[PDB]
Amino acid sequence: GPLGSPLTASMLASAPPQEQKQMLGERLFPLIQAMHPTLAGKITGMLLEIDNSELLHMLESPESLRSKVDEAVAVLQAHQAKEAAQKAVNSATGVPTV
């Protein structure tokens, strides 16, 4: 809630099990917290529609997890890419060559 200044890992300790959807969401924010250099904040958001049974499995699977959130980090790079290229388009579009 008001303790949105610190990290989410700290929230975990300061957030009961029912506070899942709050802080770590499923378990997203914490994993992407390590991959925060990108934008963990918004990443968890989109991928928040993930399973709760898989959330636990993610924290137990460094290989299977990081692989999933790996793409998550990419969804961000594309998120700000297709968003800025809205009205700020200088280059021409594709031609209808069939």
């Binding site: 899942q20 959807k21 709050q22 969401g25 499923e26 904040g41 918004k42 968890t44 958001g45 989109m46 991928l47 928040l48 529609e49 993930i50 399973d51 709760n52 999933k68 959130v69 793409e71 998550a72 990419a74 969804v75 594309a78 998120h79 297709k82 968003e83």
Partner: peptide, 22 residues
Amino acid sequence: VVKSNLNPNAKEFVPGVKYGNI
């Protein structure tokens, strides 16, 4: 629109409720 790759339901994070639950 903004299509995601991982989750097919890329939506903002709306706490309070268990988003992505059944």
